[PDB]
Amino acid sequence: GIPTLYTPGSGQFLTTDDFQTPCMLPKFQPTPVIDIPGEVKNFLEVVQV
Amino acid sequence: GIPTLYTPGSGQFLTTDDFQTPCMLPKFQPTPVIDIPGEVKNFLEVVQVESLVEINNVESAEGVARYRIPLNVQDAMDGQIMALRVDPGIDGPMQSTLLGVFTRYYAQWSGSLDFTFMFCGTFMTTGKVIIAYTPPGGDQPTNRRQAMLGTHVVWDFGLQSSITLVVPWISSGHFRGTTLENTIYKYRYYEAGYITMWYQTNMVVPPNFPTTASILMFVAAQPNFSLRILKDRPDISQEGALQ
Amino acid sequence: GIPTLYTPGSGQFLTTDDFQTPCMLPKFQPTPVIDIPGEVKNFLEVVQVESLVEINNVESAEGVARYRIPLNVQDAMDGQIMALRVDPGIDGPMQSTLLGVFTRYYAQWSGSLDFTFMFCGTFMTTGKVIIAYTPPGGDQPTNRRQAMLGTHVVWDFGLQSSITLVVPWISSGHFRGTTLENTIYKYRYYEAGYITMWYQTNMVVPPNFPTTASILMFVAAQPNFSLRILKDRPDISQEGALQ
Amino acid sequence: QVIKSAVRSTVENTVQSTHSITTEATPALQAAETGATSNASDESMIETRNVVNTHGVAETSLEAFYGRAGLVAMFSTDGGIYRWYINFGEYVQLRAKLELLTYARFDMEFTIVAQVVNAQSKVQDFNVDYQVMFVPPGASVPENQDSYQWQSSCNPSVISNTGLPPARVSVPFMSSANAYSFSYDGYTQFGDASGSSYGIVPSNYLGMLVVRTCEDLDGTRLRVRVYAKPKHVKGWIPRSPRMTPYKSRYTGVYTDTTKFCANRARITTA
Amino acid sequence: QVIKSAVRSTVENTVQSTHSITTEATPALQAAETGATSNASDESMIETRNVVNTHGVAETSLEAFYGRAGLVAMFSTDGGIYRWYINFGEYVQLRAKLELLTYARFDMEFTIVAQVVNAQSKVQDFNVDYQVMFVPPGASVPENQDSYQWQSSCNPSVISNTGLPPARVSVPFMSSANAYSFSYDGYTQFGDASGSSYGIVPSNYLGMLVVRTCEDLDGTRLRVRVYAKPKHVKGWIPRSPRMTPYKSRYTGVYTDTTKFCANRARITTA
Amino acid sequence: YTNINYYENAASNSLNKQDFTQDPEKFTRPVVDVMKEAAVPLK
Amino acid sequence: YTNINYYENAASNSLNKQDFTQDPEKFTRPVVDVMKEAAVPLK
Amino acid sequence: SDRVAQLTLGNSTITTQEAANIVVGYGRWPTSLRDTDATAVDKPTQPGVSAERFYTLPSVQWTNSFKGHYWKLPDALSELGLFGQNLQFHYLYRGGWVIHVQCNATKFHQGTLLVVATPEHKIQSAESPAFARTNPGEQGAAYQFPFTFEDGTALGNALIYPHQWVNLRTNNSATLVLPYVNALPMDSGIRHNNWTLSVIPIVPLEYAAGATTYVPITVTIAPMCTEYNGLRAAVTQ
Amino acid sequence: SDRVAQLTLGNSTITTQEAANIVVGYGRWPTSLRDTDATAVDKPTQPGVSAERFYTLPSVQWTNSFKGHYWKLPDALSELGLFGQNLQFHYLYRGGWVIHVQCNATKFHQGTLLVVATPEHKIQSAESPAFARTNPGEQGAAYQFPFTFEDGTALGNALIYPHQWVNLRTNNSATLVLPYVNALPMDSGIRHNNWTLSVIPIVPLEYAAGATTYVPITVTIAPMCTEYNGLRAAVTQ
Ligand SMILES: CCCCCCCCCCCCC/C=C\[C@H](O)[C@H](N)CO
Ligand SMILES: CCCCCCCCCCCCC/C=C\[C@H](O)[C@H](N)CO
Ligand SMILES: CCCCCCCCOS(=O)(=O)[O-]
Ligand SMILES: N[C@@H](CCC(=O)O)C(=O)O
Ligand SMILES: N[C@@H](CCC(=O)O)C(=O)O
Ligand SMILES: [K+]
Ligand SMILES: [K+]
Ligand SMILES: [K+]
Ligand SMILES: [K+]
Ligand SMILES: [K+]
Ligand SMILES: [K+]
């Protein structure tokens, strides 16, 4: 066993956290990304209208 | 799973710990750092500035007057003007100074101190005073003769209004405790010594002039001063959450 | 999150563990390491120093006198002077020595021992004594004849006041237990042997001289001595927190 | 500008000096009127020896002085909820420290410690789930334990348990300003000459924390303590330290005094 | 200086010797009066064989002897708080070990084990939050469970729970001296010829630990044990080991005795 | 020794480890005319 | 094997792993005049 | 550290024959807003010599009961010359200062004044400060609690801020050059006072019997390196 | 290991014709304070030959009831010659020693003395030690508990400290050179005694009937490589 020391924060659920988590369907393969007009990347594109 | 073994300490909240923790706003972008005069990087920059010593801490002295050392035309010789312990972190005249507030935020100190005195009598008022630093061993000196056997400076009044008395770092150990609390820790072990002022000659004035004048007392840390072990300043307290 | 699997041992506090732990004062800077004479790196340096053996542990002997081996002019030959077990960690004459205090802090030992004897009679008092080390097997020898069949040294009194008797490491195993506690562990298995002293000739004195003189007994570990497995010294105890 | 600031990691050494009988060099003579601090050095006032001084200066850096958790809030729920306004004037210790600088920029580490207590304020060994939601100004504040606002789809929330280690998150430098101000000689809004709007930097107020218990406790309540630790500290313009007691949580109002240190019998007795 | 100290990792080998009949070499003859320990070796007193000895010397190093936790304090709260003065004279085992060196420098690992007990001192299965605050000399010491000093904005504090693994922190070499002293033939202050101020190194006292329970326990109390482990040990001038019982926590006072080992009937009987 | 960042934003980083001091001149001697130690201040 | 430091201050480090002994001469034979084993001590 | 000086700004020139060097706060002279700090996008106005000159305020008498007097900046000049006009007409203002405090007596008098400029000096000795004390105008206001600096701190530690002393035996004036300080690139000149200039007596005015007893203290201030943004109609707090 | 010696320091020369080599504590001769260990910033005083010479103390009689005698250093010389003067006038002191213990009898006598110098030898056999025992002066003090070394340890293990023996059949003197030892670069010579010098009889004085029975023990000590800091007026504990 590798010596570890867990710290404050452990177990907490922060809604803005960003960890990698096991996928429920590890081998799943999504449909293709097709060509669709009007893609938006940032909402600043929208408030400029 | 990677084999791990958690150890004692796990889950504890040490207020001085230093871990990396997830940010609540991962993608947040702070405003720019603009140009602002007077940046400080270390508090040692601040204790090196001279601030006034509340040396006249007597019943009769209130407010601004507690900063004034009193001089007056003598009719006797070799007399004493003032006395004080040089210890920067103990209760007394030095606790409300910059050097003191910060020395009181720490448990140990080391370094030479800068004691600067400025005369405020009239341009025609003259005088010579001797200021001495007596190293540890006994009690404050009892007369000028005993005082001048230590580290001193003879000050002559003139155009250059002030004079500096460096109380050099002379200690058995590299550091001293900031308090001399004795009943428990027996910290009187650390007492740094005394600083006394005496008339070298006399304060002489022309006819009809004020026969008493004032000396202001400045104090700062020298460039070889440093503090160790942060602790809570004893003068800041409360009885309950503020309304 | 990185997949982990905690194991048995987790959370335990083993007093001999060796992990890195957060410091309470992360940025603290200790005073300098100055030059101080007499540094020690290993306690083996200390058990190699000769210290006095409390060899005269009898009712009639109190205090300083328990360090004195008694000699006296004989009127019979080949007589016995003293006897003792060489085991350094068991109760008896050797437990208050440096070698003993430290052997008693450990559970196993190995090595040759240095037994040095110094004569303290008058310059005119002469004599020859035989000191022997009898290896394990039976009981201490009963007469000089049986003793001299083992490892011995014949000592002649003179200007060189002392003599050394090396009790060499002769053991079946590489190490021995420091105690011979028998009722449980049956550790009498480890007994190292005996050391006896006998008159080789006689102690002869001129007219009117003291007819008894003293021998002091020194003991230390040789350079091939080592200890293993630390344990609490049995002689240090208390009944409750000290006032 | 004109005066440069060199950087160092150890205090200054002492070098050997000798006697001096001269009329050209008078280092002991100063003039405090100039606004300058004396510059007479050890070597010039006495005969000194050589001393290679290696005493460090680390524990007095802004980061070493400020870099540790301190209490900023303590409270109990009333109906399974509590709303606290994020401001550090409730508890004086950390407050008196921050007010040693005029302007400063820093990130923060918030640690939250919670536990359940009964009506007589006696701690209970009860593990319950709790939620801490940061509600910025302009966002709808929850009226009670189960209002819709706790869905928290945009507002940051942290959900932990009184049986889990304390919760902890880092917070960036969030002001609209370029530094937080700990002294402000001005008003909060235009057209207001009222004392109630003096000395408050509104941009130092970034919202409130609303705490609740995910499910109702039967007869007990959540007791919460919020600690805050400054990180990556940057500060400008050191200030004269606080020498009188705090009275109000939101202002520096104080009671005048005639002395700071206690008196002694004679100025000539140490 | 004059005598050099070589370094080694194994005890000395034994090399084969032979007989000797001579008047030039007398290794067995010594003179204890000189202050020197005999230097007669195995090979010179008897005929020996070759022995490649690889027995190590590691477990007798300062670090192997001192490097393990030992009890230094044990106590219970009275009103949800307790103040202990950091000094190792309460428990004799670790004390007797440290006093084997005159001066020494070392870091320390403190492990704190806590649990709740009722009035009859019977352990309870109760998980409660506790706080341990280090208060250096000159800092205001808490009078009780909820005084303002527990805000701990500068003083180091550790907050853990009786249900979490024991708490543990490392501590640097903190004395104002260049080493801790375990024997001091002097006084604590100038102008004091009193026996009560003799033999105490004040710089060995760095404060106190104040323990409390974050919230009040109803009828029970916190039972605490503090363990301390020396690390990175450096020592000078080994001392004559303690041979009589300790009586006082703060001084080496003792009761004289006339023997150390028990007596036996005859000096000639092993 | 190891100082590597795990999180995205710099606010998550541990305390700065550059604890030095700088010349206090901007605070102790903010004057225009140089007043050398060996000289008299007012001339 | 692995010996790498995680924490900032050296007080956090694990125990020293250099456990050797040195010549005890400064303690066992702190004399000015050399007294060889083969010789008589007092001459 | 010469004892004489001449200060010439715009169409105004000031002189003193008994000075004690010149202080530059934080070692920084006044500078204009850089393009990387700026946020207000409109081209600024820069009055030049019309607003960057010396303005003398009405004198204060060093009486026997005198505790000190203070002026807030830019409040004190908020209504003087074109500097004040520009302050009112613009939402935003930025600028530095050159301060010259004057007080001559004779070689038969003794007294000592602390002349300090404090960044963000709050007048908080009252629960609800009166606008007449936080913003006293060109006449400034008198000190009521000089020992606690009107803000709960020690007067003695006010030397941590840019300052000089007027010690009658040594000098008859104090001169300070102050840079702009704020946690913002610019701010409103009517809603926020960046600096406060105080003259507090620490050693009382005394003199040989019969000497002149009427001793005034005159303060003369000059905006320096100023710039304004957000032009509109005139507005005061 | 010669049996004769001459020790010359300053204006004093000592000789012995029956020595037993010379011990140097911890193998280190006295050395001055290095610049990297020093902390007191003032230039030190170094008396030289005025204080670094041999001082002989009053003799002690080896009586029948004799348990031993001890002297504390620098206490024992705290009032002798210029060494003592320098000790009193300075706050700080640092220094080494050269010790020569003397005791001659005849070839018709027998007895053995342990001559040991112990660093930080506490006299703690009493709950509140009397100043007259912790600091006995030049006359020193007598042993009351020699077996427990007055500090709760075994007399027999005192050989872990620098020592020699005076075994009447072998030598009439013991010689020790001690370096400065402390957890400090310097310390006060009046508040702390670094070394203690004890002469304890382990084998009682005996002799052929009629031999001289009056046998003294004389101790002669010399400060060596000393330095002082923190000059002021004279002060004693
Ligand atoms: C979800 C976890 C809770 C995170 C809370 C984040 C709150 C944002 C922190 C703002 C810190 C700014 C504090 C600055 C100044 C103080 O309030 C002053 N004392 C007010 O004058
Ligand atoms: C927040 C966790 C608690 C950490 C406590 C830190 C305390 C500092 C440790 C000081 C250790 C020095 C001990 C040295 C000597 C002993 O006290 C001696 N027996 C006293 O003579
Ligand atoms: C009460 C249960 C506490 C055990 C949780 C500890 C998980 C171990 O953490 S680990 O070292 O990162 O793998
Ligand atoms: N928004 C939910 C309640 C939120 C909660 O309890 O988590 C509702 O209105 O039903
Ligand atoms: N300082 C707080 C109490 C501290 C605590 O209970 O954590 C107060 O006076 O309200
Ligand atoms: K340096
Ligand atoms: K000068
Ligand atoms: K200075
Ligand atoms: K070997
Ligand atoms: K030999
Ligand atoms: K040996």
Coordinates of C-alpha atoms and ligand atoms in Angstrom, one line a residue, chain B residues 48 50 114 164 220-223, chain D residues 37-40, ligand 8:
Chain B
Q48 CA 12.1 49.5 10.1
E50 CA 10.4 54.9 13.0
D114 CA 17.2 52.2 16.4
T164 CA 20.5 58.1 17.1
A220 CA 12.6 51.2 14.7
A221 CA 14.3 47.9 13.9
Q222 CA 17.8 47.7 12.3
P223 CA 18.5 45.8 9.1
Chain D
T37 CA 14.2 57.3 9.4
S38 CA 17.7 57.4 10.9
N39 CA 20.4 55.7 8.7
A40 CA 23.1 55.5 11.4
Ligands
K8 K 17.7 52.6 11.1

